[PDB]
């Protein structure tokens, strides 16, 4: 079953630069998030349908991350991903899609809505650990990227 959620945040981080560090965030990302190593494009060119995996580390181990870029709605200032493999990926789960989305917010900053998309397989519920884990990741990608565009103002 697919299970939703979403949740609303802020940035004073206007949507448009917002969104064109969205689009670089496989060179983001590993300087920022300590955990995150490396991002490889497996196939396609950076659009919907190409399949990337992420290198981390988690306890002095190495793991793998697919992730498959899902749709890129620049109308619409959207970014959107699912994890499809790897320990990101809990054992009883198909898939996860993370979304963003930004609209202008009141004061030259931006709202934020991000959607969670929890496939389970057949009638499993998900579990509440990993729902928790997954909004915290989605939440820091995007404290990661704006974090980036505030302390380098000069690039966006
Ligand atoms: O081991 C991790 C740690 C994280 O903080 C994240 C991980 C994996 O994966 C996601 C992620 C990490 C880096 C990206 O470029 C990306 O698009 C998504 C998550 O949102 C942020
Ligand atoms: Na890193």
Same mark, same amino acid.
């Given at each position: 079953?697919?299970?939703?959620?979403?949740?609303? $945040? %802020? !940035?004073? =981080?206007?949507?448009? +630069?917002?969104? &064109?560090?969205?689009?670089?965030?496989?060179? $983001? %990302?590993? +300087?920022?998030?300590?955990? =995150? +190593?490396?991002?490889?494009?497996?196939?396609? &060119? @950076?659009?919907?349908?190409?399949?990337?995996?992420?290198?981390? =580390?988690?306890?002095?181990?190495?793991?793998?991350?697919? *992730? #498959?870029?899902? !749709? $890129?709605?620049?109308?619409?200032?959207?970014? &959107?991903? !699912?994890? =499809?493999?790897?320990?990101?990926?809990?054992?009883?789960?198909?898939?996860?899609?993370?979304?963003? /989305?930004?609209?202008?917010?009141? &004061?030259?900053?931006?709202?934020?809505?991000?959607?969670?998309?929890? *496939?389970?397989?057949?009638?499993? #519920?998900?579990?509440?650990?990993?729902?928790? /884990? @997954?909004?915290?990741?989605?939440?820091?990608?995007?404290?990661?990227?704006?974090?980036?565009?505030?302390?380098?103002?000069?690039?966006?």
């Amino acid at each position: 079953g697919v299970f939703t959620f979403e949740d609303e $945040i %802020t !940035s004073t =981080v206007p949507p448009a +630069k917002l969104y &064109n560090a969205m689009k670089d965030a496989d060179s $983001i %990302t590993p +300087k920022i998030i300590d955990d =995150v +190593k490396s991002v490889e494009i497996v196939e396609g &060119n @950076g659009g919907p349908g190409t399949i990337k995996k992420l290198t981390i =580390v988690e306890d002095g181990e190495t793991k793998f991350i697919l *992730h #498959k870029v899902e !749709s $890129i709605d620049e109308a619409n200032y959207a970014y &959107n991903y !699912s994890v =499809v493999g790897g320990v990101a990926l809990p054992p009883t789960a198909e898939k996860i899609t993370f979304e963003t /989305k930004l609209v202008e917010g009141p &004061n030259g900053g931006s709202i934020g809505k991000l959607t969670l998309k929890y *496939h389970t397989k057949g009638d499993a #519920k998900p579990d509440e650990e990993e729902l928790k /884990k @997954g909004k915290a990741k989605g939440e820091g990608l995007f404290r990661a990227i704006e974090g980036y565009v505030l302390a380098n103002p000069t690039q966006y």
